[PDB]
Amino acid sequence: IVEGSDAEIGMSPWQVMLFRKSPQELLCGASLISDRWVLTAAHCLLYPPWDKNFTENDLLVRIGKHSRTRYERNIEKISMLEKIYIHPRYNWRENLDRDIALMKLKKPVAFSDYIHPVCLPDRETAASLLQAGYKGRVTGWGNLKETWTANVGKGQPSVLQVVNLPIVERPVCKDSTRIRITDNMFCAGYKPDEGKRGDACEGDSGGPFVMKSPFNNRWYQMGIVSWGEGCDRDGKYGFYTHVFRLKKWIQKVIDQFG
């Protein structure tokens, strides 16, 4: 997360870390949507251009964490994965259309102060909250800036980072990039003339874009960190998987295999 700030303890209890088992390596963000289901970006599991092709047994997740690296006994929880489900029409070739995957935990996780699920949105919440200029929240332990320097390298954070960013008009999204974007992703970020900044960055992939409903005070996951051209560049925007538009796929899978 670029230009974000330290999260408060338990600010984002649905936050999930995705690791490669061996060698041990933080791969991506993700989120807890129930006691046994975790949502993430498809590209975190499958991305031919970069030779990524992970399956259930290559991975584990960590739930309830605050600190990026320190072990947090009696707070964080570790789980293995029973199965991995990538959206059948995920398009990595052209435009990362349908960049979404589900991960079933081998064993249910126990809720706590530090581990709690996020709501997926219904039609109304999505229609109400997903409007240009309305802000959501992105969270992750990815890099603090796009380019490497001597001061902790590319900059990696001690604690979970948080930033709020406004949803952007689709014309502005579409004009910002040569890529053929689809209704299955939206983009968010300040415009150049707005003089705030912020973005997801490398390693935030797969983590949640959340909004708090003023109707029922509940947090909803509207987006999945998907792709971008570097991080925090003027006139560029982060793209996010449109969770609501893919809810039927989400639900069918949770039904047929849960």
Partner: peptide, 30 residues
């Protein structure tokens, strides 16, 4: 489940995080 999206250490204790107000402001302010 039916308890989704209410954080033990915030909503459930009637406590606000330091930046949630920014989101609410974005919903109202032109």
């Amino acid at each position: 489940e039916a308890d989704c999206g209410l954080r033990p250490l915030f909503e459930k204790k009637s406590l606000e995080d330091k930046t949630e107000r920014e989101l609410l402001e974005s919903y109202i302010d032109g």
